[PDB]
Ligand binder design. Structure first.
Ligand SMILES: N=C(N)c1cc(-c2ccccc2)c(CC2CCNCC2)s1
Ligand SMILES: N=C(N)c1cc(-c2ccccc2)c(CC2CCNCC2)s1
Ligand SMILES: [Ca+2]
Ligand SMILES: [Ca+2]
Ligand code: NA
Ligand code: NA
Lengths: 236, 10, 236, 10
C-alpha cells in the first residue's frame, strides 16, 4: 500500500487535516493505511474512518443518481435515441462506487470485525458492513441483487441483536444503526411497514431513557432521534 | 429521500 | 492518453454529463481528451474546459489555504512543535495543484493558443494562461515566484491589448479578463492602486456601453460588472 | 477575499 511507509500516528494526524480541508478521498486513503497497520481502532479513529468513506461514497451516490435519472429519461417514450454515452458514464461512476464499497467491506472483513469484541466497536463495524452492502444494493440490478440485500440484512440484524443486549436505547451507535436499518427496510427491502415500526419503537424506547443522560449525551441522542422522526413524517 | 445516520457517532 | 480511444463528440457529451453530476475531475479528464484530439474548440467547448479545471483547482486552492493557515499557526510563538506532517500534507496538496496548473498551461501551449486567431478565443485562452500562472503564484515562495508572476502579467497584458482593440467594453470575456487582472494586481503583484484603477475604468467604460445591448447580453455584462463593484467595495 | 471571474463567459 502507498501508505505502508507512513507512521500510524501520522496517518491519523493527516486524516484529521484532510477532514479540515474537505479532502475526503485523501482522508479515506490515510485511514485505510491506518487500518492496514493491523491494530484495532479507537472510537475517534473509527469515526474518522466512517467520515472519510461516507463522504467519498456520498459524492458517488449523488452522481450516480443524477446520471441514472438522465439514463432513464433517455429510455422514455418520445426521447431521441442518443448513443451509449450516458450508460457508459453511469457505469463508470457505478463501478467506482462499487470499488469503494468493496474496499470498505474488505477492511471490515480483514480484520476489523473479527478483532472487535467490545459492543461499541463490534456494532459500529457491523452497521458499517450493512451500510456499504446497502449502497451496493442501491445500484444492484437483480443477478446478485438479492444476495447483496440479504448480506446487508444479515449484518444489520447481527448488529441489532448485540446493540439491544449490550447498549442502552439512547446509545447513539444503537440509534444510528436502527435508523439505517429502517432506511434499508423502506428503500431497499420494500418493507415500509417494518421500517415504520422499527423507527417508532426505537424512538419511543429512546425517549423513555433520556432521563438517565447528561446534557451532552442528551444532545447526541436527540439529534439522531430527530432523524427517526423526520423519516416517520416522510413515510406516514 | 430518507435520512440516514451521520458518519460520526458516540 | 486514456481518452485517446474515445470519440471527440462522446468526450464532449460526457463532460456535460459530469458537470451535471458535479464530477469535475472527470469533466476535466474528458475535456483534456477533447483538446488532445487536436481540433480547435468552440465557444461552448472552451467554457466546458474552463468550468472543469476551475472547479478542480478551486477545491485544491481552498484545501491549500486551510492547510497553509494551520501550518503558519504551528510556527507561531507559543505553539507545540508537532512533526513534519502539516508541512508534508500541505506540500502534497500544493504539488497536486501545481500539476493541474501545469496540465492546463500545457494544453494552452500545445496547441490551443497558437491556433486561436479570433479575438474571442485568443483572449479567452490568454486569460486562462494568466489565471493558471496566478494560481501557481499564490503558492510560490520566491525562487521562481518572480518569474511566475511576470508570466501571469505577460499573458494578461497580451489579452488586455487584444480585448481593447477587438472587443467592446461590455464583452463578458473582456470584463472577466479585466476583473481577474485586477485581482492579480491586488492579491499577487502588491499593486492595489493599479487594481482599483483598472476595476473602476473597466466598470465605467462598460456602464457607458450597456445601452447598445439586448436584455440577455445586458444581464451577462452587468453580472461581471457587479463583481468589479464588489471588489472596489472590499478594496476601498 | 477578492472575487474573480466565473468559469463560463460569453
Ligand atoms: N473528527 C471527527 N469527525 C470526530 C471525532 C470524534 C471523537 C473525538 C474524540 C473521541 C471520540 C470520538 C467524534 C464523536 C464525538 C463527537 C462529540 N460528541 C461525542 C462523540 S466525531
Ligand atoms: N455548460 C456550461 N457551463 C456553459 C455553456 C455555454 C455555452 C453554451 C452554448 C454556446 C456557447 C456557450 C456557456 C456560455 C453561455 C451561457 C448563457 N449565456 C451566454 C453564454 S456556459
Ligand atoms: Ca479486540
Ligand atoms: Ca484558428
Ligand atoms: Na454495472
Ligand atoms: Na512545494
Amino acid at each position: 500500500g502507498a501508505m505502508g511507509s507512513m507512521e500510524r500516528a501520522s496517518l491519523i494526524q493527516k486524516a484529521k487535516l484532510a477532514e479540515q480541508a474537505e479532502r475526503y478521498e485523501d482522508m479515506a486513503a490515510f485511514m485505510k493505511g491506518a487500518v492496514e497497520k493491523g491494530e484495532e481502532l479507537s472510537c475517534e479513529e473509527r469515526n474518522l474512518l466512517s467520515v472519510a468513506y461516507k463522504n467519498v461514497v456520498g459524492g458517488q451516490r449523488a452522481a450516480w443518481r443524477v446520471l441514472s435519472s438522465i439514463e432513464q429519461k433517455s429510455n422514455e417514450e418520445g426521447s431521441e435515441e442518443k448513443g451509449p454515452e450516458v450508460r457508459e458514464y453511469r457505469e463508470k461512476v457505478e463501478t467506482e462506487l462499487q470499488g469503494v464499497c468493496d474496499t470498505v467491506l474488505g477492511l471490515l472483513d480483514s480484520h476489523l470485525i473479527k478483532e472487535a469484541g467490545d459492543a461499541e466497536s463490534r456494532v459500529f463495524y457491523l452497521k458499517m458492513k450493512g451500510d456499504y452492502y446497502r449502497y451496493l444494493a442501491e445500484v444492484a440490478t437483480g443477478d446478485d441483487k438479492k444476495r447483496i440485500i440479504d448480506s446487508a440484512r444479515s449484518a444489520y440484524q447481527e448488529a441489532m441483536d448485540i446493540s439491544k443486549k449490550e447498549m442502552p436505547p439512547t446509545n447513539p451507535i444503537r440509534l444510528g444503526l436502527a435508523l439505517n436499518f429502517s432506511v434499508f427496510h423502506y428503500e431497499i427491502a420494500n418493507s415500509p411497514e417494518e421500517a415504520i415500526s422499527l423507527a417508532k419503537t426505537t424512538f419511543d424506547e429512546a425517549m423513555a431513557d433520556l432521563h438517565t443522560l447528561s446534557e451532552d449525551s442528551y444532545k447526541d441522542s436527540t439529534l439522531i432521534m430527530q432523524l427517526l422522526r423526520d423519516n416517520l413524517t416522510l413515510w406516514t | 429521500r430518507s435520512h440516514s445516520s451521520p458518519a460520526s457517532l458516540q
